[PDB]
Design a protein around this ligand. Structure first.
Ligand SMILES: CCc1cccc2c(C(=O)N3CCc4ocnc4C3)[nH]nc12
Ligand SMILES: [Ca+2]
Ligand SMILES: [Ca+2]
Ligand SMILES: [Ca+2]
Ligand SMILES: [Zn+2]
Ligand SMILES: [Zn+2]
Length: 231
């Protein structure tokens, strides 16, 4: 129950737009930050809090910032071919075998277009630790309750780097009837865990907003992104 104006100020802060406007001497009023967001999300570039921009801001999305103060270790790509993953805990929203299969299908999408392989393990030292969490869940990037941000993930590297977390204040499903597709959100978050950033192409898997589809989720932009990372 923020005003539209308050939601806009919070969205622009959280995803990195306000900080870039400050570095350009232009954080006194909303217009410059709105133009940065419109370019980054491929909306019409009006510099106004218009209907398209407010609808974009109310849309469920990824919790990773779009522009950006979090320093990580190393060059943010994996340096071995066999990437391991551990499912640390489970949402009660789905059967464990359906959760396991949703993540395995999300890895299979990336496996075909990268020289990496993805193997399930049962170990704390897996490259990609998968966790379900609510609000403050042990990393100082707290979730926000139902809707808004759905999940986040860290770029390749040691410890927390490469891990994927899902907001369990969300209802997880396969995206049909009620709830968010765990398969589609996992495929997006696993992109980050391989070293990809957000796309500006609205049809691309790596676009930040949640879009349900029954079609093949990869687009040219995603496949080309991976190609420009891993020889
Ligand atoms: C939400 C976790 C988080 C907080 C701040 C920055 C984050 C990033 C991030 O910096 N990037 C997204 C992944 C990436 O690959 C190459 N560069 C990047 C940049 N990923 N997860 C992040
Ligand atoms: Ca890790
Ligand atoms: Ca949420
Ligand atoms: Ca839940
Ligand atoms: Zn994302
Ligand atoms: Zn987290």
């Amino acid at each position: 129950n923020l005003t539209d104006r308050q939601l806009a100020e919070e969205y622009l802060y959280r995803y990195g737009y306000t900080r870039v406007a400050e570095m350009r001497g232009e954080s006194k009023s909303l217009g410059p930050a709105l133009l940065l967001l419109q370019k980054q999300l491929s909306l019409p570039e009006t510099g106004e809090l218009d209907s398209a921009t407010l609808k974009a801001m109310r849309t469920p999305r990824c919790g990773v910032p779009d522009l950006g103060f979090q320093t990580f270790e190393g060059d943010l790509k994996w340096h071995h071919h066999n990437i391991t993953y551990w499912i640390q805990n489970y949402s009660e929203d789905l059967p464990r075998a359906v959760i396991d299969d949703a993540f395995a299908r999300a890895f299979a999408l990336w496996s075909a277009v990268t020289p990496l392989t993805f193997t399930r393990v049962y170990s704390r030292d897996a490259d990609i630790v998968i966790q379900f969490g609510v609000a403050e869940h042990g990393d100082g990037y707290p979730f926000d309750g139902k809707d808004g941000l759905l999940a986040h993930a860290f770029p390749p590297g040691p410890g927390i780097q490469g891990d994927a977390h899902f907001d369990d204040d969300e209802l997880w499903s396969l995206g049909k009837g009620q709830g968010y597709s765990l398969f589609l959100v996992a495929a997006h978050e696993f992109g980050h865990a391989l070293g990809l950033d957000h796309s500006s192409v609205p049809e691309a898997l790596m676009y930040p907003m949640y879009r349900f589809t029954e079609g093949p989720p990869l687009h040219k932009d995603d496949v080309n992104g991976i190609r420009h990372l891993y020889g």
